[PDB]
Design a protein around this ligand. Sequence first.
Ligand SMILES: [K+]
Ligand SMILES: [K+]
Ligand SMILES: [K+]
Ligand SMILES: [K+]
Ligand SMILES: [K+]
Ligand SMILES: [K+]
Ligand SMILES: [K+]
Ligand SMILES: [K+]
Ligand SMILES: [K+]
Ligand SMILES: [K+]
Ligand SMILES: [K+]
Ligand SMILES: [Mg+2]
Ligand SMILES: [Mg+2]
Ligand SMILES: [Mg+2]
Ligand SMILES: [Mg+2]
Ligand SMILES: [Mg+2]
Ligand SMILES: [Mg+2]
Ligand SMILES: [Mg+2]
Ligand SMILES: [Mg+2]
Ligand SMILES: [Mg+2]
Ligand SMILES: [Mg+2]
Ligand SMILES: [Mg+2]
Ligand SMILES: [Mg+2]
Ligand SMILES: [Mg+2]
Ligand SMILES: [Mg+2]
Ligand SMILES: [Mg+2]
Ligand SMILES: [Mg+2]
Ligand SMILES: [Mg+2]
Ligand SMILES: [Mg+2]
Ligand SMILES: [Mg+2]
Ligand SMILES: [Mg+2]
Ligand SMILES: [Mg+2]
Ligand SMILES: [Mg+2]
Ligand SMILES: [Mg+2]
Ligand SMILES: [Mg+2]
Ligand SMILES: [Mg+2]
Lengths: 184, 147, 32, 261, 141
Amino acid sequence: GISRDSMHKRRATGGKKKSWRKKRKYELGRQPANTKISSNKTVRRIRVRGGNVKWRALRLDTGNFSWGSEAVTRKTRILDVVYNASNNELVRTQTLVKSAIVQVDAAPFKQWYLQHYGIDISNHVVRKIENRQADRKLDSHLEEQFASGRLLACISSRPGQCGRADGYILEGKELEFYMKKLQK
Amino acid sequence: AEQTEKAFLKQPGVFLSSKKTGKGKRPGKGGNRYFKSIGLGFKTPREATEGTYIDKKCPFTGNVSIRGRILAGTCHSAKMNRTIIVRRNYLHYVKKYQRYEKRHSNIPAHISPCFRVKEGDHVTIGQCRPLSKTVRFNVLKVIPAGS
Amino acid sequence: EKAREKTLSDQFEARRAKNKASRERKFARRKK
Amino acid sequence: ARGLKKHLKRLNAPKHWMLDKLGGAFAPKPSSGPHKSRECLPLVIILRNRLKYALTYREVISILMQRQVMVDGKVRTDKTYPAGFMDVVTIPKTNESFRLLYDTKGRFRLHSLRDEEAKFKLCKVRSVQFGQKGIPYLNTYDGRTIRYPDPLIKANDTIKLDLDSNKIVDFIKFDVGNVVMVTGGRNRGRVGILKNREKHKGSFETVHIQDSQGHEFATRLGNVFTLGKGSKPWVSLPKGKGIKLSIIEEARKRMAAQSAT
Amino acid sequence: GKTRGMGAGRKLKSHRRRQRWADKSYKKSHLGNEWKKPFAGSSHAKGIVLEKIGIEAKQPNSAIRKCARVQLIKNGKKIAAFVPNDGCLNYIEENDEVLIAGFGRKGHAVGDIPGVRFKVVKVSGVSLLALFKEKKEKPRS
RNA sequence: GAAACUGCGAAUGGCUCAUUAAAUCAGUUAUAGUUUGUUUGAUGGUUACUCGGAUAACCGUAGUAAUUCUAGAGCU
RNA sequence: GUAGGAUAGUGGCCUACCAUGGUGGUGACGGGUGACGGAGAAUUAGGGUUCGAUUCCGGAGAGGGAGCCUGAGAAACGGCUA
RNA sequence: UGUUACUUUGAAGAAAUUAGAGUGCUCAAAGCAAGCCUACGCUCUGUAUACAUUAGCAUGGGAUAACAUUAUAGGA
RNA sequence: ACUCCGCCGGCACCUUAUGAGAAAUCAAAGUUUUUGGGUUCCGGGGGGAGUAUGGUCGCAAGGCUGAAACUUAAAGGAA
RNA sequence: AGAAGUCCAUUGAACCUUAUCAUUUAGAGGAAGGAGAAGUCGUAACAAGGUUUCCGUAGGUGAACCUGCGGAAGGAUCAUUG
Ligand SMILES: [K+]
Ligand SMILES: [K+]
Ligand SMILES: [K+]
Ligand SMILES: [K+]
Ligand SMILES: [K+]
Ligand SMILES: [K+]
Ligand SMILES: [K+]
Ligand SMILES: [K+]
Ligand SMILES: [K+]
Ligand SMILES: [K+]
Ligand SMILES: [K+]
Ligand SMILES: [Mg+2]
Ligand SMILES: [Mg+2]
Ligand SMILES: [Mg+2]
Ligand SMILES: [Mg+2]
Ligand SMILES: [Mg+2]
Ligand SMILES: [Mg+2]
Ligand SMILES: [Mg+2]
Ligand SMILES: [Mg+2]
Ligand SMILES: [Mg+2]
Ligand SMILES: [Mg+2]
Ligand SMILES: [Mg+2]
Ligand SMILES: [Mg+2]
Ligand SMILES: [Mg+2]
Ligand SMILES: [Mg+2]
Ligand SMILES: [Mg+2]
Ligand SMILES: [Mg+2]
Ligand SMILES: [Mg+2]
Ligand SMILES: [Mg+2]
Ligand SMILES: [Mg+2]
Ligand SMILES: [Mg+2]
Ligand SMILES: [Mg+2]
Ligand SMILES: [Mg+2]
Ligand SMILES: [Mg+2]
Ligand SMILES: [Mg+2]
Ligand SMILES: [Mg+2]
């Protein structure tokens, strides 16, 4: 099957390598997951070397995404793949791979923001909410996309390896970089 | 800027969007640029501690450790991107004739942007994990030719 | 690249001449 | 091979076992255990080749399956159990108790012990690090793991382990001036005072040891085992006391023995 | 004269490599042409006697050396094998199995026999020496 | 205590030298670049007086020229 | 080189994109070997020449290829599929 | 702290083979045994040691030799 | 211009062995089993044969590079 | 939960082309070398070998060889201040 050996490669000088042994099981590869965004979740269990387990996600719809500046992580629905640095064909096929830029539902984070800062984007409770409002700062670029209900996010997990699609909300100069790539 | 690829390049684990400031924190914390000492008596160049380049294969700011053999040689080719060919000259002993013959070996090595190198310069390379099909070494020091 | 080598050559040739003036000035003062 | 080798050819067995080359095609393959297969003495060798209690491979099994042999205070029934340096072997029926120590020629010697001295052993500390829940632990070179060790214990130190309480009674820091034994290499079995430690960044650390008679020899840190603080070891040594004699000196003793004996 | 430099190890080694070919003994073993000989590097060989022939002895001798054309069974090559001793040709019949050996000079002709480098050792599984001394008899009749 | 289920082993050993010329291999390294049944040591929180449905051996209807070829039924 | 995919894991191992590099009379590349490598063997004043299929170590194969299940471990052949 | 070769010493280094110590298998090729006295045994019985290119690792030496370097000193 | 003394460089010659060599002979062809200043080319019994083949150069004639099968007990040098 | 079957992709045996290379081998005829007691024709080399021999090159002749041009002594001359 798929093999990760170097025997089929050319030498650094350019000469060929004559085969001196058959393929080994301990140097195999496997078919890519090609995880897609779909509400029909499907993750198949793969037995790997040592009797260990890998989770190969064929279809996913939700992910665990973290708002780094706010230090809050929420499970949210994945809406769309918008950018992929490796292959633009993975964008129109809606493939979920590590480091792909996706849009996630902003609703779970809005609820936390309202519950935490008391703002939309009980005597002892109002005492602390206003206290936390003193040091409240929200990026203009990050707030502008709360109106549409979608947040740009980057997948930080490997769905074909762990079976999950987790990530973090884009912000700072990383958000500026990617939103300029989408400005066409 | 250093952002020239299709993806956004950054150091892993360095959070750049923190409300607090990084003033008074160690490298790689508070959004501060991350760098480290490789040991073995080698100095961290000022160009790596105060630079803005992103190189995950850099020995001082990347994610590669130096362990194994430390070798020296002369820069033979500096035409690849962040990779050079190091020529190592040595003598092979011919037993029957009790004499020597000159031999050489070309060792590919990764060079981080913090180093400036030209053909003929003397370089020291430290072994690291495989970085490509042929590269197993990282440049640790460059001495300009004629110095 | 051209600017990189221009600044180094221009600044090196500056202090390289300043040191020559300073050494000659120091020599003039040592004679007396 | 497609997996693990289960056989040991007799000529490939460690030389310090002193197995005759024509005794058979195979040697006992040491089982997995606290000591490495090249630095151990399987119980079958001890019971049959060293002590002569068993005459054959079969008889060793009979002795062990009666639960008559203990290693480090616990009964062992595995014929190829890897008993190694500082291990205490006890045979209650014969009232015997031995400690595995190297003689000055580098071979394991069954050093008879007193009942009082057979209640502990020395172990070399491999490393100290935090485990799960931030609980510190140390592991030794005989496969043991001790949780909540004294914070002063560091790598390469020696700990005195009580075989009853299974706790660290006392420890010796690794430092120049202590008496050590060599546990590997050319100088295996030699005892001396650690005189110097030469560190080489990225490379092995060399230790210079001086014998009681002024003979100085070097070796790697991994082959050193501290036996006591200062100059007195905490364990009983064999007759040679780690003093390696020249072949000329050894021949001199043999000649004198024939004149007297 | 000879190259003497301490760093001249390569030249001395490569010079000898080229010059060993000038030696006839060296070139005969490393050329690979020995495998094309009728024995193809073997010490002996079996064959079938095609015909019994006589060869005129080379000068200044004068005789008819009794030989036998033999086709080797393993490769089908035809050779001339001398039959030694007096009246031993009478022990050999055509279309008979004979063991052949070299003549003693490693593929070179021997004595006054022109162009003959093989001799007959056995016939029908029996040595000519045994038949000559009446130790054994050929298995037939 | 046969049989049978379950567990483990059969990846060692033995044989051979066809392919293979910086390859194998040798001395020397590295894994801070990984997996590792077993052994050994340590470590695993503040209907329950014990759940459910199957199946082998067995039993008895068999098919095929035929195989540790094979179908259905009754048990546990 | 960058970003991914795959892998027990490193790596053009594979994919997308980008750069134009890499090796070579210090013999690359190709060809020959009646070439498995070594520990060693024969003969040796010294240096050397020749040999090393074979019981120890390493590798490789099970009529030729390829593929794979089970399993901690096999691309297994006194396992399976073509 | 210019970089090397060379040399010295040491560490690490499979066994078997080779050299070699001990030992009267009747000798020998070998083998790794045995020996001592006459008790419920002893000699902690023995199963040494050297060699092991080249490359790599680490101390001492600095003659010989290689490369690098020098005056607008970017000198101390 | 010629005569005498000398120095450096050159083409050579003459005598001689304390040298070398199989000798002829050589002041280098010496300082070589008491064997080592540096470096290039090149030979390994006689033939087949500077032939066949491949490559390369040439308008051609040919040049350069260059085998094997096989054959033979000598061929050859000095005296 | 799930069989047959189906779809796309991957790995990919196997077979069938053209092409190339390798090794072996037939071939009318042409033609080389060598060997084979005691063939035919001359006499070219050895003496100044009866035209001194030889090298390069070119042409010619049954055959060895002959001739032209330049060269060598390994010549049959170390020699004419006559
Ligand atoms: K393996
Ligand atoms: K030679
Ligand atoms: K198994
Ligand atoms: K190796
Ligand atoms: K990988
Ligand atoms: K890459
Ligand atoms: K298993
Ligand atoms: K003169
Ligand atoms: K003539
Ligand atoms: K003449
Ligand atoms: K003419
Ligand atoms: Mg095996
Ligand atoms: Mg280390
Ligand atoms: Mg000379
Ligand atoms: Mg069973
Ligand atoms: Mg080849
Ligand atoms: Mg290599
Ligand atoms: Mg990658
Ligand atoms: Mg591509
Ligand atoms: Mg060989
Ligand atoms: Mg072969
Ligand atoms: Mg072999
Ligand atoms: Mg073979
Ligand atoms: Mg055999
Ligand atoms: Mg083997
Ligand atoms: Mg196999
Ligand atoms: Mg067969
Ligand atoms: Mg198979
Ligand atoms: Mg079989
Ligand atoms: Mg098998
Ligand atoms: Mg003279
Ligand atoms: Mg000489
Ligand atoms: Mg010749
Ligand atoms: Mg004439
Ligand atoms: Mg005439
Ligand atoms: Mg004439």
